[PDB]
Amino acid sequence: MMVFDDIAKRKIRFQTRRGLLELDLIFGRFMEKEFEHLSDKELSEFSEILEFQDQELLALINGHSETDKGHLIPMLEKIRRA
Numbered sequence: 001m002m003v004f005d006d007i008a009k010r011k012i013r014f015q016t017r018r019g020l021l022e023l024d025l026i027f028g029r030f031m032e033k034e035f036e037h038l039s040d041k042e043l044s045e046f047s048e049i050l051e052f053q054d055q056e057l058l059a060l061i062n063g064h065s066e067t068d069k070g071h072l073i074p075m076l077e078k079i080r081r082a
Contacts, residue, residue: 004040012046018054030082045075 012035016027017059038046056065061080065071066069 002041002044003071004043008040008043008047012043012050015050016052016054020054020058023058026082030079033082034079042075045071049075049079050073063079 012031013027016031017024035043035046048069052060052065059065060067060076067076
């Protein structure tokens with residue numbers, strides 16, 4: 001229901017990081033670039049995309065996995081961007 005607090009902050013990260021170095025690097029700037037602009041509301045979506053694993057995420061961008069949510073369609077564009 002559109003939530004976000006000091007927790008979401010650590011959450012965003014606590015969620016990221018996995019068995020993907022490159023993916024671990026991306027987040028570094030990706031977030032600092034996105035998460036920085038990503039407003040509380042937006043941060044809500046990030047969790048939706050982040051929810052996915054590192055592999056899936058990467059593959060996703062590559063066009064491997066799929067997304068059963070149109071709320072990420074946009075987030076992917078922006079996110080995938082950074």
